[model samples]
Target: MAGHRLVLVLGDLHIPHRCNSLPAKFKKLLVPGKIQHILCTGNLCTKESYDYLKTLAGDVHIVRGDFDENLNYPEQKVVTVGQFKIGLIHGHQVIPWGDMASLALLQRQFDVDILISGHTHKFEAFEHENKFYINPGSATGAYNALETNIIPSFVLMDIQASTVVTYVYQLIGDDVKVERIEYKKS
Candidate 1:
C-alpha cells in the first residue's frame, strides 16, 4: 500500500508564553481521525500542549527543545514509518542556526532518509544529497529569539514505502494556505 500513513510534523508551541493558541483556521482543519501520527520537533512548553497533540494522534514522537520543561525528552531521536527512517531533533545546537550544511552532517550521523527539526520558527523544506529535510516552523506562531511576527505553520507528510508527499500548512492573515512537495528515496 502507498500513502498509508500521515505524519504531522509541528513544533515550537511556546504555549502560554510566546503565544496563546493556534490560529482558528488551522484548528478547524486539524481535527482528529485523519492524522495517523505526530512527529513534533519540540518546544511545546507545558503539559497542555503535549495533551493537545495527544488528542490528534495516538502515536506522538517529541524531541527536547531549549524551552521544553520536560527535560526528559531526548535531544535527538529516530523514528520509522512506512519504510523510512526519520531523524528528529530540536535543532538549536546546530551552529549558524538552520544551516543545511551543518544539518547534513547530522543527517549522515543519524543515518536517516528524512530529517525533521525546528528552532528558527520558520518553515523550510528541501533535499540535500538525496535526503529530505523539513522544519515545520512555529505551530503557535511563537516568537523566536531572532524574529518577531512569525507566521503560523506546520507540515503533514504522507509516507508510503520509500516515497513521501508533504503538505505545508501556513496561516497567512485569515487564510490557511497549503503547498505540496514530494520526495522519493533512490
Candidate 2:
C-alpha cells in the first residue's frame, strides 16, 4: 500500500494449546495477497498454525516466545520496511510486563522506530519519546499468565516512506473493530 509496504504485526497465538484457532471474523479480515510481509511475535505453538500465517503472506519473520516449538526462532530481530526500522520480540522477559521503561531500553537496543511485542494477550499501542510500541495480543484469545478471557486481536501496519498508519483489529464479541492510528518518523 502507498507504494511502500504493508507489514502485518502479529503474535502470541497459542493455538491448540491455550485455544483452538483464530476467530472466524479475524480470519475473514486476514485475506492473502495484500500484505507485503508478516512480523510475528511467536507462540504459534504448532507447525499447523505457522502454516496458516504463510498462506496470508509469503515473507513471514518470526521470533521465539516463552512457549514456542520453533526453538531456532530468534529471541529478537530487526527488520526494515520502507523507511522505518521495526523490532520484533515475544516480550515475556520484560519485567513488570509491558512497562514503558523496559520497552524503551529495548528500543534503544534495537534502534528502531517501532517496537512490536506480545505475551500479555491484550492489545495496546502508543508512542513514547517519538517511538511507537505495539502488542498485537493473542490472535486466538489465549489465556496469559497475567490474564484470562483475553480478546482476540492483531495489528497491520501500512508503511509509507517516513510515515506509518497502524490499524488495530480486535474481535469483540462477534464483531471486529478497526481503528486507524498514525505515527510519523523523526
Candidate 3:
C-alpha cells in the first residue's frame, strides 16, 4: 500500500451565519492538493457546510452529529487512507461528553490507528495506549458549556509510515496560534 503523509481533520463547525465562516488565515494555510483526505467530525448543520468541504477537497469523510439536520450521514464512519485506518465520530453518544473511556471503547471496536471526534468545542490531541485521538474543536468558534470565549481552531495531520504529526490551529485574540503534537505507533 502507498503511504499517506497528509490529512486534515476538523470538527464542530456549526456555521449558522456568514459571520461564522472559518478564519481567513486558516483557510489560506490549507490547499486542496496538499491534503490527501479531509476528515470531518460533523456538526455541519447544513448542506452548505458539507458542500464547502467538497469544494476544498475531493476525498471527504464525515460522521453525523446530534445537531446535524442531515440524517443521511452515518453516526460513525471508518475510512482507510493509504496504510492507516481512521475512525470518525461526532462524540455526542458518549454521555457527559469527551470522556476517554467511551472513546476507548469505540477505538477498540473500530480497531483504527487514529480516532477523531469533536463536540466539546475544545482542541485536543493525545496518544492513549499507542492510539491517536483528536478533537479539533469548533472551527466556526461555536459555543460550549465549559467555555464560550474560546477561539476558533482546526487540526492538520501528517500520517507517515510509523509516525503522525498533528498541527493544531487556534485564533488567539487577533492572531492565530499553531501547535504541533506527534504520536508514533508501535
Candidate 4:
C-alpha cells in the first residue's frame, strides 16, 4: 500500500459543443485530494476543461484527440508508474477505431504494459497479449451519431508495484455503477 497510486483516467468532454458540463454524479465522485495523477484521452475542446482537471491532480497527461483545440498536445504519450509503462493515445488515428488488432499494433509501438485511449464515447477494457487496454469513455456523455444513448464514464486505477486494480464508474440513468478489474505486470 505504501507505493499505491490512484490515477484518474478520463476524456472526451466536447464541452460546450456537445454538453455544458460533466454530470452531477461524476463531478461529485471526482472531488480533489485523492488522485495522484490524471490521464486524459483528449477531446476536451477548451482550456476550461483542462483547468478543471488541474484541480484534481498536479500531474495530468493528455493526448491530442481529433477535436481537441490544443494543438500542442502530442498524438501519443508514455507514462511510467511503479513498474509499469502506460501509453496514452486519443485513438482517432487508429483506423477502424477501437479495433483490437489496430490498438495492439499501437501498444507494441509504445511497448507499454497498459494502453489508454478514447474517442468512441464508449467504455471498454480488455487484455490483449497479456497487456492491459482501457477506454475511459466520454465524461460528458457527448453526442454521437452512432449511438442514441451515451453514458458518462471514467476510470480510476489503483496501482501497486506489480498490480493495478481498475475501477470503472459509469452513470447509467440516475445511478453511478462502479466495476472493478485487475491486471498484473507480466
Q: Report lDDT (CA) for all predictions.
A: 0.92, 0.90, 0.84, 0.91
Query: Over 4 Å off in model 4, which ranges?
Result: none
| TM-score attained by model 4 | 0.97
Error of 4 at 33 (Å): 0.8
The Cα RMSD of model 2 versus the native structure comes to 0.9
List model 3 lDDT by residue over 61-98, tens digit each.
88898888899989999987656688999988877798
Using all chains and alpha carbons, the TM-scores for the candidates as numbered come to 0.97, 0.97, 0.91, 0.97
At residue 126, give the lDDT of candidate 3: 94
- Candidate 3 stretches greater than 4 Å from native: 1-4, 17-19
Q: Which stretches of candidate 2 lie over 4 Å from their true place?
A: none
Kindly report which residue pairs in candidate 4 clash with one another.
none
| Local distance difference test, candidate 1 | 0.92
Tell me which of candidates 3 and 4 scores higher on lDDT: 4
Model 1 scores a TM of: 0.97
Superposition error at 4 for model 3 (Å): 4.8
Task: Estimate the TM-score for candidate 2.
Answer: 0.97
Give the alpha carbon lDDT tens digit for every residue of 1-186 in model 2. Answer: 449788888888888788887899988888999999999999998799889989999999999998898799999999989889999999998988998999999999999999999988889988889999999988888899966889899998988879899999998988998999999998
Top lDDT model: 1
lDDT of 3: 0.84
